[PDB]
Amino acid sequence: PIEAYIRQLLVDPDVVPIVSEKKKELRVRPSTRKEIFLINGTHLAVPAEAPIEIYGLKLRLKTFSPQCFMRMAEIGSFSPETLGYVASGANLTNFIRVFMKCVDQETWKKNGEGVVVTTKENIIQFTHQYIELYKFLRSGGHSWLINRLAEEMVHRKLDREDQGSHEEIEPEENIKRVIFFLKELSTMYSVSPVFTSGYMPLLYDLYRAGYLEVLWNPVEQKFLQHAEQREKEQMILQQVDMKLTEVITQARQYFKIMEEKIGRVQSDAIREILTMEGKVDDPNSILQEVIKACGKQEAELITTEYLNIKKQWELQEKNACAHLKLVKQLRSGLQYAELLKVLESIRVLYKEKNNTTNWNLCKACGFKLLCPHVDMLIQLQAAEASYDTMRTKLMKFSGINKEKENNQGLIYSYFCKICGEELAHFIQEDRTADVGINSKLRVFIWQETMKACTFIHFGKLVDVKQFANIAVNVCLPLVYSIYDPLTQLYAVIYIYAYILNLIYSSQKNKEFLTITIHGMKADSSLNAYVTFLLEKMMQQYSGIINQLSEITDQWIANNFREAFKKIIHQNGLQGLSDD
Amino acid sequence: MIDQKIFETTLNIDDPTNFCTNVEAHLLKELENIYVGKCFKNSFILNITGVIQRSPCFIMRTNNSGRGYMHVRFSAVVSYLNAFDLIAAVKIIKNDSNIILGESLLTEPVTIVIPSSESQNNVAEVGQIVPVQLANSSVYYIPGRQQASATGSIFIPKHTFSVYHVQEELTQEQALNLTKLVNIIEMLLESRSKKDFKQICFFEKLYYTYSISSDEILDLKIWKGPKGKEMSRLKPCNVLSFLYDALKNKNSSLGFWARPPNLLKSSPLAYQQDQNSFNATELPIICSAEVMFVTLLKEIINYLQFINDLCDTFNNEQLIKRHENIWMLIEQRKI
Amino acid sequence: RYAVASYGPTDALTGQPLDGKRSHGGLRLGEMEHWVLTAQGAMQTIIEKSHDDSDGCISYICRNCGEPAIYNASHPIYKCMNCDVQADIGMVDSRRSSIVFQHEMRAANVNITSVLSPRVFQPA
Amino acid sequence: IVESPSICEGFVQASSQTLVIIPDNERITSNVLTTFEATRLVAVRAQQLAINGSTMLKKKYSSPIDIAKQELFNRKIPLLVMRCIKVTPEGQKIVEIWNPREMGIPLLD
Amino acid sequence: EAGYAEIAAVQFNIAGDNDHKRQGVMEVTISNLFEGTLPAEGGIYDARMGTTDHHYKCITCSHQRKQCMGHPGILQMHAPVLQPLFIAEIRRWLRVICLNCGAPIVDLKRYEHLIRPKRLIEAASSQTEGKQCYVCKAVHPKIVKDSEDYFTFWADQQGKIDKLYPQIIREIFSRVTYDTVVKLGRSKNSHPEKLVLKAIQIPPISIRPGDINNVIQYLVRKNLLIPKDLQIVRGQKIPLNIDRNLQTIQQLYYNFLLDSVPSIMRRLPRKEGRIRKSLLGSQVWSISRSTICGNSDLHLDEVGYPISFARTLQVAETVQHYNINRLMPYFLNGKRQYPGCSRVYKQITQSVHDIEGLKQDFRLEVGDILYRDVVTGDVAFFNRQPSLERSSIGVHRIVVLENPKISTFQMNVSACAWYNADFDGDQMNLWVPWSVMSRVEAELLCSVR
Amino acid sequence: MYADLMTRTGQVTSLEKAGLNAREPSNVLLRMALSSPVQVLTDAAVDSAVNPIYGIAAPTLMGSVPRIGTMYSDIIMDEKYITENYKS
Amino acid sequence: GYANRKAIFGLQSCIVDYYRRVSIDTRLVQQLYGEDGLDARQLETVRF
Amino acid sequence: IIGKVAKIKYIDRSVMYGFDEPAVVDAVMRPHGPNDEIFGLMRLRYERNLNIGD
Numbered sequence A: 001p002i003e004a005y006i007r008q009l010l011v012d013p014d015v016v017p018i019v020s021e022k023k024k025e026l027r028v029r030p031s032t033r034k035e036i037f038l039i040n041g042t043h044l045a046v047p048a049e050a051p052i053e054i055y056g057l058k059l060r061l062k063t064f065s066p067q068c069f070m071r072m073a074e075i076g077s078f079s080p081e082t083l084g085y086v087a088s089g090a091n092l093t094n095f096i097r098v099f100m101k102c103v104d105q106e107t108w109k110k111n112g113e114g115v116v117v118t119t120k121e122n123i124i125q126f127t128h129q130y131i132e133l134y135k136f137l138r139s140g141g142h143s144w145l146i147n148r149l150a151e152e153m154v155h156r157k158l159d160r161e162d163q164g165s166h167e168e169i170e171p172e173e174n175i176k177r178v179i180f181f182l183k184e185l186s187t188m189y190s191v192s193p194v195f196t197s198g199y200m201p202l203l204y205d206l207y208r209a210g211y212l213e214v215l216w217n218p219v220e221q222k223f224l225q226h227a228e229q230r231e232k233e234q235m236i237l238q239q240v241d242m243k244l245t246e247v248i249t250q251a252r253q254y255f256k257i258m259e260e261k262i263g264r265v266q267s268d269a270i271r272e273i274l275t276m277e278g279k280v281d282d283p284n285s286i287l288q289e290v291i292k293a294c295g296k297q298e299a300e301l302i303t304t305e306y307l308n309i310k311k312q313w314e315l316q317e318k319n320a321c322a323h324l325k326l327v328k329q330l331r332s333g334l335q336y337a338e339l340l341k342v343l344e345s346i347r348v349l350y351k352e353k354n355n356t357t358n359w360n361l362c363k364a365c366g367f368k369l370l371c372p373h374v375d376m377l378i379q380l381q382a383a384e385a386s387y388d389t390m391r392t393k394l395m396k397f398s399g400i401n402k403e404k405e406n407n408q409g410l411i412y413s414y415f416c417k418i419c420g421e422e423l424a425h426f427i428q429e430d431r432t433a434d435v436g437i438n439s440k441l442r443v444f445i446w447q448e449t450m451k452a453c454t455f456i457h458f459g460k461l462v463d464v465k466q467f468a469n470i471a472v473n474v475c476l477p478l479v480y481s482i483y484d485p486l487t488q489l490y491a492v493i494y495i496y497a498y499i500l501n502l503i504y505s506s507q508k509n510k511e512f513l514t515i516t517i518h519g520m521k522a523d524s525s526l527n528a529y530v531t532f533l534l535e536k537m538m539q540q541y542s543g544i545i546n547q548l549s550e551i552t553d554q555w556i557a558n559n560f561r562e563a564f565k566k567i568i569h570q571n572g573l574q575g576l577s578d579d
Numbered sequence B: 001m002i003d004q005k006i007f008e009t010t011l012n013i014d015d016p017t018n019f020c021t022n023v024e025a026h027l028l029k030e031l032e033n034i035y036v037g038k039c040f041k042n043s044f045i046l047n048i049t050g051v052i053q054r055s056p057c058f059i060m061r062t063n064n065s066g067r068g069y070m071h072v073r074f075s076a077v078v079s080y081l082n083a084f085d086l087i088a089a090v091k092i093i094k095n096d097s098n099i100i101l102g103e104s105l106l107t108e109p110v111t112i113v114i115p116s117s118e119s120q121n122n123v124a125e126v127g128q129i130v131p132v133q134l135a136n137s138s139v140y141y142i143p144g145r146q147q148a149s150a151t152g153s154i155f156i157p158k159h160t161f162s163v164y165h166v167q168e169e170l171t172q173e174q175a176l177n178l179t180k181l182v183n184i185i186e187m188l189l190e191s192r193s194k195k196d197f198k199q200i201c202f203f204e205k206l207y208y209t210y211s212i213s214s215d216e217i218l219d220l221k222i223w224k225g226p227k228g229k230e231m232s233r234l235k236p237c238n239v240l241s242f243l244y245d246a247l248k249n250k251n252s253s254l255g256f257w258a259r260p261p262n263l264l265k266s267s268p269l270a271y272q273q274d275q276n277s278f279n280a281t282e283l284p285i286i287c288s289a290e291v292m293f294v295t296l297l298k299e300i301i302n303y304l305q306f307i308n309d310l311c312d313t314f315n316n317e318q319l320i321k322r323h324e325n326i327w328m329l330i331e332q333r334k335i
Numbered sequence C: 001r002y003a004v005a006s007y008g009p010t011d012a013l014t015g016q017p018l019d020g021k022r023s024h025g026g027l028r029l030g031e032m033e034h035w036v037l038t039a040q041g042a043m044q045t046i047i048e049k050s051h052d053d054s055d056g057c058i059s060y061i062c063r064n065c066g067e068p069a070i071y072n073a074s075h076p077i078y079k080c081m082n083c084d085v086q087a088d089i090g091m092v093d094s095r096r097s098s099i100v101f102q103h104e105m106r107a108a109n110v111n112i113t114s115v116l117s118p119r120v121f122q123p124a
Numbered sequence D: 001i002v003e004s005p006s007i008c009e010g011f012v013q014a015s016s017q018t019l020v021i022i023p024d025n026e027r028i029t030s031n032v033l034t035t036f037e038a039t040r041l042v043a044v045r046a047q048q049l050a051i052n053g054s055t056m057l058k059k060k061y062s063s064p065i066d067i068a069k070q071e072l073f074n075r076k077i078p079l080l081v082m083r084c085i086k087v088t089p090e091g092q093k094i095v096e097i098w099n100p101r102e103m104g105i106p107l108l109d
Numbered sequence E: 001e002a003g004y005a006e007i008a009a010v011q012f013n014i015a016g017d018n019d020h021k022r023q024g025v026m027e028v029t030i031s032n033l034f035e036g037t038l039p040a041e042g043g044i045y046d047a048r049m050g051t052t053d054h055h056y057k058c059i060t061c062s063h064q065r066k067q068c069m070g071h072p073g074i075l076q077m078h079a080p081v082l083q084p085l086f087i088a089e090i091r092r093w094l095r096v097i098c099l100n101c102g103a104p105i106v107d108l109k110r111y112e113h114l115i116r117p118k119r120l121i122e123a124a125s126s127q128t129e130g131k132q133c134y135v136c137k138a139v140h141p142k143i144v145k146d147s148e149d150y151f152t153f154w155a156d157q158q159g160k161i162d163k164l165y166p167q168i169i170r171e172i173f174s175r176v177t178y179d180t181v182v183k184l185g186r187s188k189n190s191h192p193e194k195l196v197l198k199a200i201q202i203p204p205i206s207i208r209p210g211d212i213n214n215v216i217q218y219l220v221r222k223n224l225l226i227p228k229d230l231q232i233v234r235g236q237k238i239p240l241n242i243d244r245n246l247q248t249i250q251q252l253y254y255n256f257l258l259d260s261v262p263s264i265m266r267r268l269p270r271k272e273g274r275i276r277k278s279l280l281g282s283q284v285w286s287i288s289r290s291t292i293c294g295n296s297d298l299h300l301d302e303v304g305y306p307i308s309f310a311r312t313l314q315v316a317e318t319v320q321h322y323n324i325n326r327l328m329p330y331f332l333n334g335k336r337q338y339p340g341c342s343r344v345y346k347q348i349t350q351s352v353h354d355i356e357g358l359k360q361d362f363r364l365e366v367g368d369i370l371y372r373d374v375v376t377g378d379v380a381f382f383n384r385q386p387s388l389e390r391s392s393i394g395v396h397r398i399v400v401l402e403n404p405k406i407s408t409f410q411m412n413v414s415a416c417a418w419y420n421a422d423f424d425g426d427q428m429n430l431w432v433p434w435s436v437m438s439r440v441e442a443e444l445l446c447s448v449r
Numbered sequence F: 001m002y003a004d005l006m007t008r009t010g011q012v013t014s015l016e017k018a019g020l021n022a023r024e025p026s027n028v029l030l031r032m033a034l035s036s037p038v039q040v041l042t043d044a045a046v047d048s049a050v051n052p053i054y055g056i057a058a059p060t061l062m063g064s065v066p067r068i069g070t071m072y073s074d075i076i077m078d079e080k081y082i083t084e085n086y087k088s
Numbered sequence G: 001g002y003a004n005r006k007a008i009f010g011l012q013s014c015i016v017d018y019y020r021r022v023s024i025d026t027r028l029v030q031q032l033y034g035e036d037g038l039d040a041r042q043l044e045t046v047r048f
Numbered sequence H: 001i002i003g004k005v006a007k008i009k010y011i012d013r014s015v016m017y018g019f020d021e022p023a024v025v026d027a028v029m030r031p032h033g034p035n036d037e038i039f040g041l042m043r044l045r046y047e048r049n050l051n052i053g054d
C-alpha cells in the first residue's frame, strides 16, 4: 500500500494528468497511455507502461453545460456518479470544487482551470480528497440528491413547455343551391357536404359524381333521379349476389356431407351428372340422390345431419368456456416457463389421455380443447428442442401420406393429420457438420497406415490409398479426443486398433472382405491377432517408446484395448468396399 | 430508496381503433402491464404514477400491418438501492459449495450474493432470514429482470468512523433541499413511535457497537432509545434541530463533525467540535456542509429503516429466537 | 413459363429465394423495378415484395449507443453488449440482406452506429 | 489545448422533440388530399378494418377496400394527415394537422 | 416490450480494440470446428455467435435459424496487426509525427486555413525526411513502403534501415495526443491508435454459412504458433521464423479482408455484389413469368392469365363479419375445385393450417386469413424487362383463362405501348398482390389508366 | 431537373462519382451504391462521416423503405373523433 | 444502361416537398417543380 | 423418380421430379463412370405438340 500504486490508479481518468521532470524523487508508471504536461510546458503523451517521474498533479475543473445534464436526464439511465460529475462540471452542483482547493499556491499556469499540487505531502492530501470525492459520489448520499434534482428539473422543463406555453360565415346563393343539392344527394350517393370557404371539396364531390352541371344549368333533378336509379340497381345486384352465394354455400355443404357419408366414388359420379347438366352448386343434388343410387331417406338423413352440424357449429360459436382463453395464453410464446404451467393447467381438462388420431375434448364444456401435437410441440419448445429435433419428433403426427400424390401445388412443409396445422418445413439438408475437426498428423496417419498394408492380407484387391484415407478419417478425430512422441504413439495405437477392428469385422460379417495377417489363418482367435499386433507395434516403434520414459508395455496394451473399444463404439463393424 | 422518476418509451398498439376509445385508460393499463415490477434504465419500477406527455397515435410506416405506436413520457415511483445499505429481511435460498444466494422480503426486490469465504457468513442455514450489509459496489439493474442483483454480507457493526472538516455552510435553498431529508426522518421516526418499545430497545441494544448491559430509556421528546457510552465531557448535538436552526440561520455549522461508534446512530444527534479531539485513524475529509449533512441524514435514514424492518419482520419471540445463532455471532464481535 | 409459391428454397447467406426456375426459387425484382415502383409511388408494394416476400425481418437497435441489441419475447432477453445497464431497445423493420451487409462492414473494422429517430411528444 | 473526449460529447441518442402544430389559420399546405395521401388513408383504413372491422358505415360491403373507400368518400374515416414541415435544431418539430373529412378527395368512384 | 423505431442517421467510424472487445460475445481460443454434431465452444463455429442450422439454436439470443442474425466474436491476437483497409492512413500518420516523442513535425498552424478533410493529406504530402524535432532532438527518418506487399513499412535514417513491426507502430501512435489529432483535422474517434489491432473481430456465423471459414481457421491456427509473451522493440533483431510467421498472419488477415480488391470486401462491389444484387435488387416469392401473347378480346386494362398459374398464386383475405359469406365458397372448394383455397391462417392457434388436412369445420372463425385462388377481376402487377419508363409496371384486371392448354400471358395489342413489348417471344413478369395495403394501392395508384 | 441539379452549387457538377461527391458529400450509402463501395466506405470511416437517411438508396441499403409517395405524409389516429363516435 | 443508372443515382434524391419545391433533404434544387408546379400527365396544348 | 439414401438410421437423399408437365420414363440404365462406380441415368421424354406460345 505504498503511495506509488495510489498515484497509479489516480492516472486512469482523462482528468489529473502528469507534469514530469527528469530530476525528482517520485516515480510511478501508468496503466494505459497518458497525455501529460512538463516543465517548460510541452504537451506530450506516454505509452501504457513507462517510468515517469511526478513533479506534481493538476485536476482540471471541466466546465460542462446544463444542456448536457438535461440530455442525460432525458436519457434517464445514467449512474449517479456520472450525473453528479457532469452536474459539478456544469455548475449545477458544488461538490468537486469543494473537495478540491487544497492548492499550495498558484505555482504553475496553463489554459484550463484546475487545482495544482506540486509538493510531497499536499499530493497525498490531493489523493485523499480525490478518493473521498468519488467515495461520496458513489455512496448512498449524492444519489438521492442528484436523481431528485434531475427529476425536478425535467419536470420543470415539462411544465415550461406544458403550462407556460400553449372562419367562414355564409356561402352564396349559387353555392347555397349547390349545397342543397349535395344535402339531398347525401342520402343517395357517397357524398357528404362540408362548409369550407374555398368550395373545393364540393367541386371534387361534383366531379367524382360525374355531374358538374349544377353550377350553371338548373337540371339537378334529372341527376337526382339518375342517382336514385343507380342506387336501386346497385342494391338489386347486391341482394341477388348474396342470395346466389348463400345458395352456393349450402349446396357445397350438402355435397361435402355427401362426400363424407357415401364415399368419393358416388359423390364424384353425381358431380359428373350435375356437371353435364349446368346445375352444379344448386340443391337439386338432393333430388338426384333421391332418385339415383339410393333411397330418399338416405338423403333426408343427409339434410338433417347438415342441420345438426350447423347447430353444433352455432353452439361452438356460443361457447364462452374458460379453456378457450387459456389456449390463447398457450399460443403467445411469452416466457416458456409460463407456457409450461399454462399447459399444466390445461392438461387437467383432458378426458381419455387422447394420445393420437383425434382431438382432446374439454370436460367442462364438451368441445375440442387441444390437439396432441400442440401439447408435444409445447413440451419440446419448453424442453430446449432444436428445429431438427422438433421436426423429426413431430413426424408421427404427419398429415396425409402418398394417398394424395400431389394437389398440383408444390409444398415444402408437413402438416398435422389431426387438424391440419403446419408441423414444420423441410427444403434441403443442412450438411454443414460434414467438416468435423495440420497436414502433418494426417500425413503421418496416412503414411503409417500405408506401411501397415505390408503385413495385412486382403482376400481381394483393395485400393490401398482409399484404405489409408478411411483410416485417417476414423483415427484422426479419435486421436484428437485423447509433435511430441506420445501423440505419435497414440496415432500408431489407433491405426493398429482400427486394423484389429477390420479383422474382427471380417470375422463377424461374412459379407465383408476377409482381412487377415500374412501367415495367420482367417479363423485365428482374436487374442492371437492382438498378440501379433502388439509385438509388431512394440518392435517397429521401439525408438519412439524409448523416448517416453513413463510408458510401459502394460500402458501400451491398455491404451490399445481402449482405442479398439472406442473405434468399435464410434464406427461399429466396418467393411472395405459380385462380379 | 423509494423515489419518483421520469421515463420515456415507445408502445406498440395492435388495434389503434379500440385503443383510441379510452387513450388514457389503455395507456396506463399497458404501461402497468409492461413496466411494473421490472428493472429498466438503472432502476426498478414499482408503480406508474401517471403520464406527463404523450405522442399522437402514429401508424407504423415501414410495414403493411396497419398497426400503431405511441411515444409515452411517464412518471413512475421506482426504487434505487445504493451501496452500504441495510436490508433487515434476506431469506437464504441457496447455500452450496460455491456461492450463497439470498432473497429480500422488503419493498426493494433484490437478490443478495453473499461470498462464502468469511467466518460470519460461511455457516448458516437454508430458510433462515438475516439482515444483510451491502458492499461498496453498485447494485446491478439488468434490464427486464424481476429483481436487482447486488452483492452483500451479514451486517456486523464496525469499529471505525469518519471525521468531516466543514468550512462552508448552507444557503436557504441548500437547506430547503434537506427539508425533504428531515421530513423522511420524521416520518420514519413516527413509524418508530407507533410501535412498542421492547423489541425497539432489544434490537438497538444488540446492534450497539459496544456491550450495553445497563438499561436506560434516554428521551429527547422526539426520539427514544437506550443510552450507551459517552466520550469524556463531550455532549452530542441533535442534527435535526441543528439543521432546522441553520435554516433559521441562528447557528454556524463549520468545524469537525463525527459519528463515533459509541454514538446512538439511529438518533438524530452527532458530534461537532471546533478542533478534532477524536482519535481517528483516518485523515479528516475536507468538504462543505452539503456532503456531511446528506451523508449523516442518509445514515440516519438507513439505520431507522433497518430497525423498523427488523421490528416489522420479527413479530414474536419465536422469530427472534429461531435465528439466535446469527445474533450470537453478533454478540461475539462487540467490544 | 414459371410460377412458384408463397415460400420455398432460401439462400443461406442473404435469406432471399434462390435464383430462377432451375433451383425452384423465386424471380428477381431487380434494380430497375424498384426505380419504377418508387417513381409510381408504390411503396406499400415494395414492402410486400422486397420485405414480406423476400427477406424482411426485425432488427433490434439500442437507442443509447446505436449498436444492434438482443431481444426475445420468450425466454426474456433484453440486453445490449455496449452499455448493458442503460439499454433502450427499439425494433426497426429491416431485411436480412441489410443486416448481413452491416455485419460485413463491421468485419472490416468499420463501426456502424444507427441513430434511431428521436421520440416526439405533444406539448401538453 | 483540445483535450481528451468527455461524456458531454459522444452521445448517440438524439434528443427528444416537441410537436409544434401550426394553427389552422396559419397553414400553407393545400386543402386537397394528394393521390398518395388518399391511397395511404384508404390502405390504412382497409387494413385496420381487416384487423378490427368496427365501422359506422350505413351501407354494407363485403371487402375492406370498398368500406375504406366509402368511408373516405362519406367523410367518416377516423384518421388524420400530419404533414411534417420542419425539424428545428432547438428540438421543435413543426407539422401540419389536416382532417381528411374536410378536404377534397382526388379519387374517383 | 421493444417499441417501434426508425433509423434517422448512420455514423461511420474506425473500429478499435475496445469496440471489438465490447461488441464481441465470445473469445475464440481453439481451432477445432465441431465436437460431434454440435459446434465446439471456443471455436470459430461456436453457437454463441449465431446459428445457421436446424440442429441447434443460438446460445446468445435463443432464436432459431431464421430469427438469429448472428453475433460477433473476439480473437485476441498474440501480436498486433495492422488494419488492412486503412494502411494508407497509417502511412500518413507515420509522416507527420516524430517516431521518438510523438509531437508533430510539421507546423499545425500552417494547415489551419484548410478544411479538416484535407489537412492531414496536404500536411503529409510535403517531404518530412530529415526534419529535426523541436522537443526531443531527433531526426525524422523516411517512411518507405515495401514494394513486395501492401502492409510492410521500413524506416530509412540516411541508409540505416529498420522494419516497423505493428507493435512498434502502436507504440508510436499511442504517444500522440488528441490535440494533434484535432488540429490535424481528424476527429477524436479517428485517433491513429485504433489503426493497429490486437483483438480482431470474428464475423458472425450468419455471414459465413457452411472458404472464408477456411481463411479464419488458417489465421487462428497460425496465430496459435506465435508466442503469447512476444515483445517487439525498435532496433531489436527478430528470429526469421517469427518474422515469417508475422508476415503470414498479416497476409492472411489482409486476404481475409482485401484479397485482390475470397474476401469480405469482394462481396460488395460489382453487379453480383451485395449492394446491387441483395439490397438494390431482390428475389421474391408469389411471382410468375411466361411468354406474352396477343388477344384482341381483352380490354387494355386486362391481362389473360392461365388458370394453372391462378391456382398457384394466392390472395390473402382476412375473415371478418362482412366477407364471411363471400369467402365461404372459396373455403369449401379447397384444392379440388376452382375457385378454391389452399391455406388458412388461424388467430386461435397463431399458426398455419392446410385445407386438405382440415375438413371438420363447418365455417371459419372471425379473424382468420384465407389464401384463396386468383379469380377474374383481381388486380395484378404486370412487368417487362428492362423497366425504362415508369409505365413498365402496371396494374391490370386479371381474366383467368379456363383453357388448360394455354400457358401464355395474353393482353390486348394496344396495351403493348406501355411496356414497349411485342409478340416475337418476349416474356413478362406478373405478381398478384395479396396484402390489403398493397392491393389498395394497386387499384388507386398503379392502375394502367 | 438535369440542369437545376447540375448547377445548384454554383458550378456545373457531373452525373458521375465526382459530381455526386460534390452535391452530396455526406450521403455515403448512396455514394457506396453508385460506383465503388470499398473506396467510399474507407473514406467515410476516417472522416467520421455522419449519414442522414433520406432519398432512396440510403433507406434501401439499411433495409427500410424511402419516405416517398404514400410514405411521405404519415397518418395519425383521430383521437377526438373515435372517442365520441366509436365504442370499446 | 450505363447512362441511365448514373442519371438516376444523381437525381433520385430530388423529391417534391410540401411547398412544391424540389430539394435534397434540406437543400433546394428547384424553387418550384418545373417552374410551374404541374404534372407532366396533366398538360394540354393550347394556342394563344 | 430415383431412390437414394445415405447410411448414417437412414437419411433420404432422394431425387424428385420437379416439373409441372408430366413426363414418361423412356430409358433407365446403370452405367459405370470413369471411377468404376455405379451412377443412375434416366431419360424422360415429353410428347410436345405445337401449342400457344411456341
Ligand SMILES: [Zn+2]
Pocket: A321, A322, A323, A324, A362, A363, A364, A365, A366, A367
Ligand atoms: Zn371448455
Ligand SMILES: [Zn+2]
Pocket: C062, C063, C064, C065, C066, C067, C080, C081, C082, C083, C084, C086, C087, C088
Ligand atoms: Zn446499448
Ligand SMILES: [Zn+2]
Pocket: E049, E050, E051, E058, E059, E060, E061, E062, E063, E068, E069, E070, E071
Ligand atoms: Zn443469435
Ligand SMILES: [Zn+2]
Pocket: E098, E099, E100, E101, E102, E103, E133, E134, E135, E136, E137, E138
Ligand atoms: Zn521528436
